[PDB]
Ligand binder design. Structure first.
Ligand code: ADP
Ligand code: ADP
Ligand code: MG
Ligand code: MG
Lengths: 467, 48, 488, 507
């Protein structure tokens, strides 16, 4: 339809329609701009007035300025022709390599799957990393979250997740950078290109990028998760695939929704957020659940404010979380890359009714022996009994070997380090840690486990070290 | 020296526990202060 | 067409449809939008009616024609909703065909007065050793499960639900059960696996599941435990005993907070308005044993309230403790220590449960509560203890053995006679020569031994609700004989 | 209840059709508040558009609410009266940019304030343009040298990025900015276009006498070739303090589009947030948190993410943003410090107990980090600063054990001693930035550990005497370090020899 801009506050411009009117949560092409100016309709107040969150720099908008109405909530280009492509929440390519020549569009602002479109089987999603799939394993339909930073290997673990899931399962992935820094987004794009996840040469790339940058208004940042989730919902519902939505930041999603609901005149909630926090997280975090056909799975980088857990954005986030794998620098300065802490990573699926009694027995043995190593490491650091017993030296040797064994050479680090990257399936992790905890490989040095994939190659590394 | 090392180990543990408890009540007091100030500003701008 | 009985949406905004006209409407009335949706007409004004919708606002335009139903907000109800996942409004969302409801129970009536009520007297066993031994529930009663994130909270309710299968496959209707699980703000996948575990455990005949998950709208999460109380209130008024669990009743108050703030209501404490206490009070207060003149029946409400990092006094846990007449309390640092469930027995009450015992459990768990109350002064004395008294170390060790006995896995609730027999082997010190890494092994061992070989004395315990003296001697005989014949 | 419904415009509307004020290009002033006019008319004005008031004033127009244009007055509100005539200019407000703005203190509309003649600008860039995207920019490829040894070693800046100076009030934090400016004299004296530099100091809501002190310090350090000083002091209006960072950032955007490098120092950017909160709350925009409205993060991000290095197709121009934030008693958890720390690519954190403890400049780190701060270094400083950072990371754990360090073991005693020598190497006098070559030499001496025997109060005297000795005698060695870019075994052997001989002849 054709309406008219009548007032402008940033990402809040309202359109006065005189005829046929778009419903709540819809798209509007503001014309006369050098670009598109897409708007999102909601609030019909009168003379068909709709309060549209306005998605770009709204300098140049005049009263009575004509607005075309497109119907659909937002159409983005989805497809297998979107892989290796950077788009933004309009659906527009911002990597400057031509348009995204695909066949089927899809509307962001879709709904959750129904209760009959659900999977009642918690299949353990196996990444292929030993420490991940042994101490905090993933779930098909999980909403898992990684607690990383700058110096830790977050990007290396992300690209390793993409390659391991694209090789082991048949799933591609999508990376929604929500509030993604343009410097950091450009470095992550060149990092994926030089690692080989994105290929600019042919049609073999493995990830689709949706970068909603910080310089965009919060109306255009609270939709980045929705856009990347819409691309991944294309992969879920028309291939039946094992998909990964990597959201780099859930706090900037919550902050963008908070600033939208602040700009729309709503009385804000508690600690500074929006009233609709749990509802918006409900819409997105329940579209990323598994279905009967595909297994979208979010891995999401999460920021806790003031190092607080009781803040409402981590409260709703941890209400939807499943694994919470910690990345850190302590075990990275212990040489293990990257320091995924398992002792602070409490996965919900770690349960012998779900993953099995052998897997849970091995995981409890590993976590208990590293907790006991941390206590006896404190005692051997203060030197109270100095090697406390033979059992002390035995568990110190075992758990030092285990901490060296939790490392894995990564295929994304193969291009500049000759340590070839291995994929280690679940059964081999179980067999390896079971044979280490059983005292079978006590007669090996601790160095024979650092950066080795399976356990039999750790045997061969112990053989090649004995020179 | 043995019993002094034991007493300072236990006092560091009790002090760390009380740091944890006081950090939790600091955070909830911080959130209450932010929500109180926010409700005062919103009440002013609404009663305007 | 007619502004008497129909009306037009002036402005649907954040959660409110201000509809024009609609003069024949009455307050708090389910009025339906021609988008197929429902809403409830709240505040009537001389220019418009504020109807809050029961779904998203995306499906509703401006000027979409709104039509009265003619009756106050209801939900379909009955025994024909048994075995089934329903929505908050009553629509079956499990996909296996529509409901065969004939009656229609109003969603917002008042709790009974103080005369048709009668106090709690029937024993409701959750099946958990800790809960039914120390903090029991009565048919008639409000018992809040308070705990943190990922603690134990839903699994206690699922064990309480699964426990009732042996009573429901039985004879007497004065013991059978009809259970409602109102999942408010949950993940939809968690409700799916809940229904899968109940179907796998054949645990559905009692069970209605009223689902208003997180992707559902917030005034739909406002309505869900009211609809569940209408289900259990139908059963209570007909005189059939009923259970209900409010999974994350804090999320019901979060949804009411958010729609309250969209109605521009003045926020109060941590942005929750003044109406939060009235919300959970008119919700929970419908539980009572009925006087036998009023049919004779009961409701048992179990809300599940969620605290941030062990905050029993936040704002909402104080409200829903001040409403419920029991606070089954849970902790998290116990749950990392390996004890499941993590009942903080000294701080966990259930209040008025110690009149709805079995009278075998009075004979076997009053001494247990005393011997475990002796344990709650000596844990620090065991921390700093190298030269302790022999009796003090003995009572400390018996408290260790009892808190090892109360551990229990998922999805295997105990029968009440099994609980009395295990606790009888636990209280007066048959465990005292065993090691705490073996008590759960010993417990599973003689539980299997008693349930296989000695079913007759279990029948005598569950038949006459008392440890008889000959049964006392024979159960002492079989505990000593198993303890002699059980090596490692 | 309407805002434009008053009996004046209603009476002139219904007594007869006017068609005389034209209602589109002009507009009559309705209710004029404390700094905001809500003018009637301007049907053809656009959003964020600078109009002029018949007194001779300017003022930029936002909110348009269907009958009224929210023009915020660019000046004193004493001389704007109800009923005055506004006029459109026709364009969103521009800033006169160019290479003729250099060495002249200007004011946020682009007009000269120091009284030494007008600006000879040739082109006006539209302020508030969009930031360059992902493909046109590239990462930090040049090392941005502060001259502060602590910053250039532990948290170095990159030509191509944004680095947020954060601290309490009167805790360094502008002295680091003036050292960052005065350091670039030696790179602006000579050749190498990809080394020469243009600093832009955007003072937002300072005193005006301290801007006079700033420009006198830059003139008598001869810092007016690189520098532009944009000034919107505390006496100036709220929107003119709001628009000050975008003006200087548009000048820097001119400098980085035309090949050259530039940095910008947003001094008191929190005061820019305060001025935006003032003008928005008087526009009755809904307040968010701490009364800051919704788009405050959008404001500082649209300001700060214009700084990036450009790819070799789009010149080679780079910008370096250095925002400055006063925190209120270490409250890093406030609104504006959390927003800008989430925006910016590094922080230089100044906790103040180090300042009064006597290690100046006050960069008290551990909270301070640069997220790219290893690739933004020369290989000399990369090697020496990497080993030095690991030594200080081992030091800072054990300082509370070093107050009782006398009765502990010897391994700690050695580690804590080395950390004390390095931590007193990192202190530096005010307004004297060190070049990269001499700070590589000094921190090299501290890392190789020719200082572990000296007294603590004699480290700084050694530092000054070693600077005098290395500048006077061994010029060619600093030439080796600044031309090779690194130590390659001959500078290493010669520095072994000269530091052993000068430690042999110090006292
Ligand atoms: N043996 C067990 N007994 C009781 N609870 C268990 C057992 N094993 C695991 N659990 C816990 O039961 C929990 C079920 O979720 P729950 O904490 O009850 O509610 P929610 O996590 O939805 O708030 C899981 O988080 C799991 O950690
Ligand atoms: N050697 C030094 N190194 C660093 N900062 C110093 C040194 N000597 C003085 N200063 C302080 O640096 C300050 C720079 O001003 P600034 O902190 O921006 O003022 P404000 O208090 O308004 O923030 C001066 O007030 C001065 O006291
Ligand atoms: Mg639960
Ligand atoms: Mg200052």
């Amino acid at each position: 339809a054709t309406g008219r801009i009548v007032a402008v506050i940033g990402a809040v411009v309202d359109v006065q329609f005189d005829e046929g009117l778009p419903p709540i949560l819809n798209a509007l092409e503001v014309q006369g701009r050098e670009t598109r100016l897409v708007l999102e309709v909601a609030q019909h107040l009168g003379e068909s007035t709709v309060r549209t969150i306005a998605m770009d720099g709204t300098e140049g908008l005049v009263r009575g300025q004509k607005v075309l109405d497109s119907g659909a909530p937002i159409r983005i280009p989805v497809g297998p022709e979107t892989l290796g492509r950077i788009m933004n929440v309009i659906g527009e390519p911002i990597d400057e390599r031509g348009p995204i020549k695909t066949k089927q569009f899809a509307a962001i602002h879709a709904e959750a799957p129904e209760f009959v479109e659900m999977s009642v089987e918690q299949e353990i999603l196996v990444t292929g990393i030993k420490v991940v799939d042994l101490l905090a394993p993933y779930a098909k339909g999980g909403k898992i979250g990684l607690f990383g930073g700058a110096g830790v290997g977050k990007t290396v673990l992300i690209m390793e997740l993409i390659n391991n899931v694209a090789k082991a399962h048949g799933g591609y992935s999508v990376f929604a950078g929500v509030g993604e820094r343009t410097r950091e987004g450009n470095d992550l794009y060149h990092e994926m290109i030089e690692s080989g996840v994105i290929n600019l040469k042919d049609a073999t790339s493995k990830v689709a990028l949706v970068y909603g940058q910080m310089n965009e208004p919060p109306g255009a940042r609270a939709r980045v998760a929705l856009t990347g989730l819409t691309v991944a919902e294309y992969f879920r519902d028309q291939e039946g695939q094992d998909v990964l939505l990597f959201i780099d930041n859930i706090f900037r999603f919550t902050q963008a929704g908070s600033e939208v609901s602040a700009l729309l005149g709503r009385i804000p909630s508690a600690v500074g957020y929006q009233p609709t926090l749990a509802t918006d997280m409900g819409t997105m975090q329940e579209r990323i659940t598994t279905t009967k056909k595909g297994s979208i799975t979010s891995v999401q980088a999460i920021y806790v404010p003031a190092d607080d857990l009781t803040d409402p954005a981590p409260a709703t986030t941890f209400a939807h979380l499943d694994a919470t794998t910690v990345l850190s620098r302590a075990i990275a300065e212990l040489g293990i890359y990257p320091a995924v802490d398992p002792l602070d990573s409490t996965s919900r699926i770690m349960d012998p009714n779900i993953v099995g009694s052998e897997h849970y027995d091995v995981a409890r043995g590993v976590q208990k022996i590293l907790q006991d190593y941390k206590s006896l490491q404190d005692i051997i650091a203060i030197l109270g009994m100095d090697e406390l017993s033979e059992e002390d030296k035995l568990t110190v040797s075992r758990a030092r070997k285990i901490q060296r064994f939790l490392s894995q050479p990564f295929q994304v680090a193969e291009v500049f380090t000759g340590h070839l990257g291995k994929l280690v399936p679940l059964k081999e992790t179980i067999k390896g840690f079971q044979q280490i905890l059983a005292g079978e490989f006590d007669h090996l040095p601790e160095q024979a486990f650092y950066m080795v994939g399976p356990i039999e190659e750790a045997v061969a590394k112990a053989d090649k070290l004995a020179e | 020296q043995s019993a002094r090392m034991t007493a300072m180990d236990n006092a560091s543990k009790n002090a760390s526990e009380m740091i944890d408890k006081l950090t939790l009540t600091f955070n909830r007091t911080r959130q209450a202060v932010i929500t109180k100030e926010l409700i005062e500003i919103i009440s002013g701008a609404a009663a305007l | 067409v007619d502004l008497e009985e129909t009306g037009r949406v002036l402005s649907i905004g954040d959660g409110i449809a201000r509809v024009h006209g609609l003069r024949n409407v009455q307050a708090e009335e389910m009025v339906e939008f021609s988008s197929g949706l429902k809403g409830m007409s709240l505040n009537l004004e001389p220019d418009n009616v504020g109807v809050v919708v029961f779904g998203n606002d995306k499906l509703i335009k401006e000027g979409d024609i709104v039509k009265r139903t003619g009756a106050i907000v209801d939900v379909p109800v009955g025994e024909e909703l048994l075995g089934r996942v329903v929505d908050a409004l009553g629509n079956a969302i499990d996909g296996k065909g529509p409901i065969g409801s004939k009656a229609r129970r109003r969603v917002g009536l008042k709790a009974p007065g103080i005369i048709p009520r009668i106090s709690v007297r029937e024993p409701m066993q959750t099946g958990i050793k800790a809960v039914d031994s120390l903090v029991p529930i009565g048919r008639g009663q409000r018992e809040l499960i308070i705990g943190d994130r990922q603690t134990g909270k839903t699994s206690i309710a699922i064990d309480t639900i699964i426990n009732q299968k042996r009573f429901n496959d039985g004879t007497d209707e004065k013991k059978k059960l009809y259970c409602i699980y109102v999942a408010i703000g949950q993940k939809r996948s968690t409700v799916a696996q809940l229904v899968k575990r109940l179907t796998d455990a054949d645990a559905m005949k009692y069970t209605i599941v009223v689902s208003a998950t997180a992707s559902d709208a917030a005034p739909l999460q406002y309505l869900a435990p009211y609809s569940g109380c209408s289900m259990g209130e139908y059963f209570r008024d007909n005189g059939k005993h009923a259970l209900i669990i409010y999974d994350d009743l804090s999320k019901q108050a979060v949804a009411y907070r958010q729609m309250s703030l969209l109605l521009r209501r003045p926020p109060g404490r941590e942005a929750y308005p003044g109406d939060v206490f009235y919300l959970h009070s008119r919700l929970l207060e419908r539980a009572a044993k009925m006087n036998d003149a009023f049919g004779g029946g009961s409701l048992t409400a179990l809300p599940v309230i969620e605290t941030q990092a062990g905050d029993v006094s936040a704002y909402i846990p104080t409200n829903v403790i001040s409403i419920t007449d029991g606070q089954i309390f849970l902790e998290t640092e116990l749950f990392y220590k390996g004890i499941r469930p993590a009942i903080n027995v000294g701080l966990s009450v259930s209040r008025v449960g110690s009149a709805a015992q079995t009278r075998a459990m009075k004979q076997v768990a009053g001494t247990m509560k005393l011997e475990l109350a002796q344990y709650r002064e000596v844990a620090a004395f065991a921390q700093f203890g190298s030269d302790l008294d022999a009796a003090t170390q003995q009572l400390l060790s018996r408290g260790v053995r009892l808190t090892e006995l109360l551990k229990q896995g998922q999805y295997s609730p105990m029968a009440i006679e099994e609980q009395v027999a295990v606790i009888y082997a636990g209280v007066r010190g048959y465990l005292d020569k065993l090691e705490p890494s073996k008590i759960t092994k010993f417990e599973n061992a003689f539980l299997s031994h008693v349930i296989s070989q000695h079913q007759t004395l279990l029948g005598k315990i569950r038949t006459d609700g008392k440890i008889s003296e000959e049964a006392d001697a024979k159960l002492k005989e079989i505990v000593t004989n198993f303890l002699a014949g059980f090596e490692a």
